[PDB]
């Protein structure tokens, strides 16, 4: 009853075909229990605790494991400390890119200065009308959308200067 | 002829049976549904004769001929086949631009199903019966067609030039009364 | 059951004259149809649970009553 | 507009459907009848628009 | 008399109620069947009346 | 009127009734539609085409 | 509206609705089939028979 | 990153979506190696052997486990020695169903006459210009679309007084 390797590269598909509409998102303000021991995420979850805000997605893409000769002399990705190769749509099939990429970097403070401890993605975002720019507090945004994926991480910080950018790799089905 | 197998259409104008009264508790036959709807459109169909022609132009209408006898005519209202129509095609047809021309309206019947469009299925959210397959549809489609004598005649031409205008609304009966 | 192996497989026969659809008691938009070839007594449609012999049509002959359509439906989410 | 969720009502002039034709062994569609009464209702409505005007007294 | 009890079609031209709006997941009742188109009849007959007197010949 | 798809009758076969409006001539009745008037057996009015008497009151 | 039909499984179960269209009369109400004109409180136009406008057309 | 448990269902909110190009498709209509134990199926195969036909899916829905009493007095579907029930588009994330059932009732002779062995579902399957009709034999296909499901089953055989009701309950991910 099993389904073919093309199935999960479509649902990737699908996944970038949103990019438009993808935000990433930040949140968890206060402390943990333990800023350096987070609890577990939990997957039944809606949306990020003290949520901070929205950034537009400024990356999105399929990818997959770079190997040698051939993406060693191609467009590159490093990440994990280790090597990926962009791959578009209209060949997802032929190179079985079943992994997604997002991307976005928060400038400065374009979203309120703080500390925190929730990163992930959501799709779908409508901001209220009349609103256009690329960052969001939560009273400028009209529906949330869906939160995707996310992970809780040990408490982080910004300043005026800094940029935060964070990135992630992800795939629709971790357990073949 | 809707009197077969796939829909079994019992109505017959000769039997001068004007009204299906449905009992309750009884099975309830699509038959009888068919020529519910079939006696209304009859008797529509014969009032609109009492008055009207196939031919009779109410408003609109309006053509344009183009220097290579290539003939198009703007959206209005006609009668045709016992029913007023409201034509909105867009087509282009060349006449031979020679002797006596007839530009003419043909209606041609067809049947839409849910294996064609597949809007017809039923679509009421949360039931036993959604995405069900159910009636289909009577599709009833006008174009033009020159020097056809089945099509009904809404303009007349010698050698490219009118022959007879009519500003407003056409009506035969009522013309022979006034004349 | 007899011709099968065992007792514990699915096997329910469906009836469906019963969802004739009557004027008043039967819901608009609900489970009944309309009145015609299929949905039509004297008319049967058995369920079977698990693999089989076309040969079980036969055995049913043999057992249902003169002037009945029969129709054999296998299903698929037992046999996984 | 009766185009909505607790009626479903799918007539529209600009398809130039001008039948519903019911099949035996279907279930039984409200949106079909409301249809049908609505073609009808259409119709006459022209009928009457290529002689008479609103408001005109009789 | 088709008020009667066989039928019980419930159309009156006092009332003005010009169309039968079914809904979904209810009973069909013939009543409503018969009001469909006993409507469409009186209004046809209306038109008509408008136009046309009884034993008018064409 | 019974049911086509079995033809033949049944528990089932049964269902809605028709209503039938023949049309019989008459000699004096006041509650017929008049179509002919007559005087000594010779027709009284003509009419060439279709009457209208809404119509006709209009153009009067 | 209840079915009021003895008897049956679906005595005085709802049904369908009925669409209520009551006519009521109005001033200078733009949206209004208009019937009558008055000016300075004086009858503007007469009409003593049925009006037919697209008879009136022709007519005219 | 963690994968939310609304992911599951917008997934499968998308494969519901496809339904209008979903179809059945059956073949390997000569013999397997061994009758008596078909082999596993490879997840690289990119159409069914000796192909058949393709039949339109009859149904596509959401589903979930059903249970009592709230579930008492409605549509039950029996499948996999369970009991399911459906599920609407737009209340897919309150009812948390990330389940999709499928079906096609192929019926009588509409696909050639023959015994088969192996079932599954494409989407995105074009016919050519003006073939309506919901039954299909491969020449009347102008392109298969993708193979999302497949299985391997022991021989079947058909005639005009049969009917093949074959059906699954999926996700992209079977097994979570």
Known sequence: ?176 | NFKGSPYLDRFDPSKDRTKVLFNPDRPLQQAELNEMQSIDQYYLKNLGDAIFKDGDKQSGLGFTLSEDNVLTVNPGYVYINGKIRYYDNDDSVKITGVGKETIGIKLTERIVTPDEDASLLDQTSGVPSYFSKGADRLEEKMSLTVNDPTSATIYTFMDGDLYIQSTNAEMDKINKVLA | ?80
Do not use: C
Not at chain 1, 16 to 39: F, H, Q
Not at chain 3, 48 to 56: H, K, L, N, Q, T
């Open chain 3, 1 to 80: 059951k007899d011709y099968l192996g065992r007792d514990d497989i699915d096997v329910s026969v469906y009836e469906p004259f019963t969802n004739i659809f009557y004027t008043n008691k039967s819901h608009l938009n609900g489970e009944d149809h309309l009145m015609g070839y299929y949905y039509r007594f004297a008319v049967i449609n058995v369920s079977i649970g698990d693999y089989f012999p076309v040969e079980i049509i036969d055995v049913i002959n043999e057992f249902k009553p003169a002037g009945v359509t029969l129709y054999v439906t296998y299903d698929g989410a037992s046999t996984i």
């Open chain 1, 1 to 176: 009853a099993i389904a073919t390797y093309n199935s999960h590269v479509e649902l990737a598909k699908y996944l970038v075909s949103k990019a438009d509409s993808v935000y990433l998102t930040i949140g968890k303000s206060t402390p943990w229990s333990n800023e350096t021991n987070p609890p577990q995420p939990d997957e039944n979850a809606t949306v990020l605790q003290e949520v901070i805000g929205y950034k537009k997605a400024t990356k999105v893409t399929l990818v997959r494991p770079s190997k040698s000769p051939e993406d060693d002399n191609k467009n590159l990705i490093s990440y994990g400390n280790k090597s990926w190769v962009e791959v578009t749509p209209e060949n997802a099939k032929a190179e079985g890119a079943k992994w997604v990429y997002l991307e976005s970097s928060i400038v400065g403070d374009e979203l309120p200065l703080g500390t925190y401890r929730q990163v992930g993605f959501v799709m779908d975002l409508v901001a209220k009308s009349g609103i256009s720019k690329f960052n969001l507090v939560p009273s400028e945004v009209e529906s949330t959308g869906t939160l995707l994926f996310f992970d809780n991480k040990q408490f982080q910080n910004r300043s005026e200067q800094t940029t935060a950018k964070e990135r992630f790799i992800v795939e629709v089905d971790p357990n073949s």
